[PDB]
Structure formats: structure tokens, C-alpha cells
Amino acid sequence: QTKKAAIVELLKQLELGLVPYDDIKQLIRRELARRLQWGYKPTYEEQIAEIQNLTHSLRQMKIATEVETLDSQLYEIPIEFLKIMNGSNLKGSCCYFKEDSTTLDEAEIAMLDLYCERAQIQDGQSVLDLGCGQGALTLHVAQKYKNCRVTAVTNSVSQKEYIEEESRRRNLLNVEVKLADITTHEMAETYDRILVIELFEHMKNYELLLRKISEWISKDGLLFLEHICHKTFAYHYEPLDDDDWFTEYVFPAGTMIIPSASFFLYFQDDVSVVNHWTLSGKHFSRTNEEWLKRLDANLDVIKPMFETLMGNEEEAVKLINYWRGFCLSGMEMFGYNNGEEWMASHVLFKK
Amino acid sequence: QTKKAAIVELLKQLELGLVPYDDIKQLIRRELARRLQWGYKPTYEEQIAEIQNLTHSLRQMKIATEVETLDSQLYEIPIEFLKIMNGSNLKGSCCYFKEDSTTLDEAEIAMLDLYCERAQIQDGQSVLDLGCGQGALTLHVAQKYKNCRVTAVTNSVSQKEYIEEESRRRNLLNVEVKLADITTHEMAETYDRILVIELFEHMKNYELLLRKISEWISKDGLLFLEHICHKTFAYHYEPLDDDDWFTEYVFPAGTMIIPSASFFLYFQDDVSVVNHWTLSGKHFSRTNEEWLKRLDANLDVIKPMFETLMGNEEEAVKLINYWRGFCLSGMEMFGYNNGEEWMASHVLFKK
Ligand SMILES: Nc1ncnc2c1ncn2[C@@H]1O[C@H](CSCC[C@H](N)C(=O)O)[C@@H](O)[C@H]1O
Ligand SMILES: Nc1ncnc2c1ncn2[C@@H]1O[C@H](CSCC[C@H](N)C(=O)O)[C@@H](O)[C@H]1O
Ligand SMILES: COc1cc2c(cc1OC)CC(=O)NC2
Ligand SMILES: COc1cc2c(cc1OC)CC(=O)NC2
């Protein structure tokens, strides 16, 4: 009764930044632990059954609902704010920290290099970057492979822009950006290597999506895929119950899906898995931590920025405290259990 | 829908010189890449079948179409403009760059020397130069082959000009020039060596043309031909689709043909191939590059020249940017993939 009110009192305290970081982390692990209790099953038969029920149900849905409440709540973020929170490459995804001494910028370059290595991109190929974001991978591949023909795809208007100027500003011609919704977009072109970095989490019907992406692959071409995940169970990001405030704490309802590490192994109707890697949840946990440090370290420039974009300081506070919850959610979630619960997954496909 | 209108806007920007060189080359490579995908075939059978479709279709057309409307939009250029863009010999065709420090003038001489070598021109012979242009080849062969008797043929009153005066301005006997349309011209004289440098690209029925040219060959005489090409497929210079702006960007519609390197091996009804060479596309690429440099470097003299030729500044701007797009298309097309796609071909025929 009143602990639903207690829940709607916690969220207000978080919106007003009244709750210390440690207390936030503590409350998060509680909901994380409750998630694991909900996810894990007593027998392995039930565990595999749960993965089957989810894979079968998604094949009845559309490629994606959520599609234009999409990135108005998210991804349509002003570029001037991302250059403060993110690294030099503006990578809005997981970064790779090999040593404790690894900076955010170094971590960004690490993942990008590992992408080219596991996707096996060579100097004379045509590359496709679905959900390119701010073009962290596009600009990186374009410069490192002068004879490549990278093509970035986005449904975001300001994401399509920053790439097109920063590509020309960096002396790059290989770069090409298209404005389209991958859910309903069709193209008669074909590429040697298709790169998808944390895009499927937003989709639903993976059979239809992979069927569409498969047709864009050149023969002897390869499809590389990264997606954050749990190592065992998968599930829609819908609240566990009355007390679950953490699920919809950052991402809007019905916009997220957390696959198991073996999830896309059950979607090989048009593609065939060649190689499969996982990656410690620490890498993303540290990534959000470095993002969090840059927010607090630059509140002097971020605050007036949010005041200008908003209309009042009140909602300028709710916004800065949202991006804190964003970083904090990523920190404690992927760093949970020594980063051996929620983590990243790399899959390499062929035609 | 809006992609058709997006193209006409681009063409207008190019006319008014509002698009930087790098975005132009980038947009060209995209179309170039699109033509390669359209040209290359998955099976060699279909690749050979395409060559046969074009070779057979040409044997029904007339020798040439759009004959004097090709003489109007092009090849009737004021001589004082060519002196600035072209080299010393005014060679309106591919030049030969042996090493990186080769000048334009050196390149013009390099090709001309290579012509006499592969044509095996010797002092006491009668030479015919079909499509002489500004007589870069005629004057060259005429000078230090004093006992030769060069004869230039042109349908351009402007080209029949410069040669004659600049032939006795250098004190030359051999040079003799004719004004006629090769498409319809008959002649009862016969030569020891006929030289055709990039003329067949404007023609259609090669069987009828080579049948006529062969009649002008003295027995034990030779026919040397140079033609730009692609190493594999051939095609009319017509738009791929409505999104293909590059095809009719430089040359007027229906006035161009891009032969295969092996194309004129299929037209040996009256002539017989003796030798066959190709030549890297980097040669003509650098050639158009040197031409482009000479344009921008002499805009202080070129502009007032175009203002005088035209009637207003608006059309003067359109014209200079045309020759810019002329050289830009030449650079990227022949320089594409290290010049191993579109290139030049040399063929030596006997009767
Ligand atoms: N329905 C949709 N259609 C096209 N792009 C979408 C999409 N839904 C999400 N995206 C894009 O996919 C990206 C996922 S976030 C990943 C960004 C980028 N790949 C990086 O690593 O930095 C977002 O930038 C968003 O713009
Ligand atoms: N139908 C036609 N009849 C006679 N000459 C033609 C012709 N169509 C094109 N030409 C000539 O062929 C030339 C092709 S451009 C090549 C010019 C010269 N051979 C050089 O290498 O520099 C043009 O100068 C043009 O005047
Ligand atoms: C809140 O941490 C997350 C960050 C990101 C994703 C998921 C996150 O939490 C599960 C996936 C994504 O599309 N972008 C980055
Ligand atoms: C635009 O580059 C070209 C230049 C020339 C030709 C073709 C070109 O492009 C294919 C052939 C010709 O008759 N004259 C020169």
C-alpha cells in the first residue's frame, strides 16, 4: 500500500539528488539480487525452457515497437553534453579496460580495435554500421582503413549530422551516413561487413531483423554483433513487481531487452555463427564509472547547459540526476558479482 | 520522390561551384562504386554474354549518332583556353607519367613517343591521324620525321585552325589537314599508318567504321588505336538509374561509350590484331589532375576569357565549373582502385 508510495518517494529523492551515491548503489544491488533470484531456476530444464519461451514469443512480434518514443527520451542528446560525459570518440557503448591504468579514451580505442580484429575488417572492404551512434566506430574504421567505404545508419537527425561534419573535419571521404529507421528500412545495396553495436537490445523480433540484415551481406561477408547480456537467463526489462523501481529507473518501459549470452544462437535461420566471445561486465562497469566522474567533474559547465536546454533549474536537476542514475545503473549492474553476472557478448555471423 | 529533387539541387551547386572538391570526389566514388556493382557479373558466362549483347547491338546502329551536336557542346573550344589547361602540345587525351615527378609536358611527350613506337612509325611513311584534336600527335610525328607526310582529319573548324598556322609557325612541310565528318567521309587515298586516339568512344557501329578505315590502309600498313576503357565490361554511357547524376555530368547524352579492354578484338572482320597493350588508369588520372591544377592556377586569366566568350558572369561561372567537373570525373574514374578498373587500351591492327 504505502511502500508503493515509499517507492514514489525514493524516485523523488533521486530526482532531487537527495540520496548519496553509496546509498543508491546499495539500493540498486538489492534490486539486482532480486532480479537474479527471479532469473535463475532450480533445475536446468526450466532454465532452458525460459529461454525458449522468450525466443518463441519474440518471433510473433514486430521488429520493434518503441520506435519513435525511441530516442526522443534518449539518443537525441545534444552533442555538446556527450563530449563532456563520453570520451574523445563519443562511444555510447561498452569500452575495454585491459589494465587498472587504462583511461576512458584508451578504453574506447581498445574496443574499437577489438571490433576490427574480431570482425576481420580489411583495407578494401565496404563496412556497414547499423546504429552508429555518434560514429565512434565509423570514424575509427574510416581513418584506419582509407580504402574502406564505411556507411553509417541512424534514425537520429543529430547523430547523422555530427558524423558528417566531424568526418569532413577529420579529412575523411569514405564516411557516408543515411537517415532511416532500420525497423522499416529496405535497401538494394550490399556490404562486405556489417557492424551492429548494442542495437538489438532495442529490437523485438530478431528473426525478421536478422533476415533483413542477412540480405544486406555480401557473399563471403561477415556480420559482427555486440550486445550486453546476462550469462544465463534473458528477459524483457519490465518491473519484477510492486517493489521493482530499478528496471524503469533509466530506460522507458518496453524499450529494452536483456538477452542471455547464448540468445542469438537460437536465431540462425539466415545467418550462421562462426565465432562467439563473451566479455567481463567490469569493462562496462568501469565505462559508466568514468562517465560518472566526468559529469561531477564538469557540473560547472553541465548545469548551465541543462538550464538552457530546459526552461528551469528544477528540471535541470532532474536531468543531471537522471544521467547519474544512468551511470550508477551501469556501474552496479555490470560490476555485480565481479562482473560475472551481467556482461557483454560478441557474435560473428556469416551468410 | 525527394531524391530526384535532391539531385537537381546538387547539380546546381556544382554549377555555381558551391561544393568543395572533396565532397565532389566523394560523391563521384559512390557512383563509381555503383557502376562497378552494375558492371561486374556473378558468373563469367553472363559477363561474356554482356559483351556479346553490346557488340551485336552496335552492328545494327549507324557509325555515329549526335555527330555535330557533339561538335557543338564539345571539341569546338577556344584555342586560348586549351593552352592554359592543356600542355605544350595541347594533348586532349591520356598522358604518360613514368615516375612521380613527371610534369604534364613531359607526360604529353611520353605518350606521343610511345605512339610512334607501338605504331612503328618510320621516317619514310604516310601517316593519317583520325580525330587529331589540336594536332598534338600530328605536329609531333611531323617534325622529326621530316620525310613523313602527316594528314590530320577533323570535323572541328576550330581544330583545323590551330594546326595549320602552328604547323608553318614551326616551319613544317609534312602537315596537311582535312575538314570532314569521319562518319560520312569517303576518300580514294591510302596511308602507310593510320592513328586513332580516343575517337571510337563517340562512335557506335564499329564494324562499319573499321571497314571504312581499313580501306584507307596501304597493304603492309598498320592501324594503331587508343581507347579508354574498363578492363572487364563495356557499356553505353547512359545513367544507371535516376539517382545516377555522374554519367551525364560531363558528356552530353548518347555521345559516349565505355568499351571493354577486349572489345575491339570482336571487330576483326576487315582488320586483324597484331599486338595488344593496356595502361594503368593512374596515367589519365594524373593527366586530368594536372589539367585541374592549371585551371585554378590561372583563374585570373581564364575567368575574363569566359566572360568574353559568354555574355554574363553567371554562365562564365557555370563553364569553369564544368571543366572542373570534367577533370574531377577524369581523376576519380581512372584513378579508382589504384587505376586498375577504368584504364587505357592500345591495339595494333594490320589489314
Ligand atoms: N529503431 C532504430 N532505428 C535506427 N537506429 C536506432 C534505432 N533504435 C536505436 N537506434 C540507434 O542505435 C544506437 C544504439 S546506442 C549505440 C550507439 C553506437 N553504436 C555506439 O556504440 O556508440 C543509438 O545511437 C540509436 O541512435
Ligand atoms: N564524328 C566525328 N568525326 C570526325 N572527328 C570527330 C568526330 N567526333 C569526334 N571527333 C574528333 O575526335 C577528337 C577526340 S578528342 C581526341 C583529340 C586528339 N586526338 C588528342 O589525342 O589530343 C576530337 O578532337 C574531335 O574533334
Ligand atoms: C544502463 O546501462 C546500459 C547502457 C547501455 C545499454 C544497456 C544498459 O543497461 C542494461 C544498452 C544500450 O543500448 N546502450 C548502453
Ligand atoms: C572525363 O574523362 C574523359 C576524357 C576523355 C574521354 C573519356 C573520359 O571519361 C570516360 C574520351 C575522350 O574522347 N576524350 C577524353
Numbering used by the authors:
A (entry chain B), B (entry chain A): 7 to 357
Paper lines:
In this paper we describe the first crystal structure of CNMT, an essential enzyme in the core pathway to BIAs, which introduces the amino methyl functionality that is often essential for the bioactivity of most of the medically important BIAs. CNMT forms a dimeric interface made up of 13 hydrogen bonds and 3 salt bridges, similar to that seen in the PavNMT structure.
The structure of CNMT with 9 is very similar to the N‐methylheliamine 8 a structure except the two ligands are flipped relative to one another in the active site, with the carbonyl group of 9 in the same position as the amino group of 8 a.
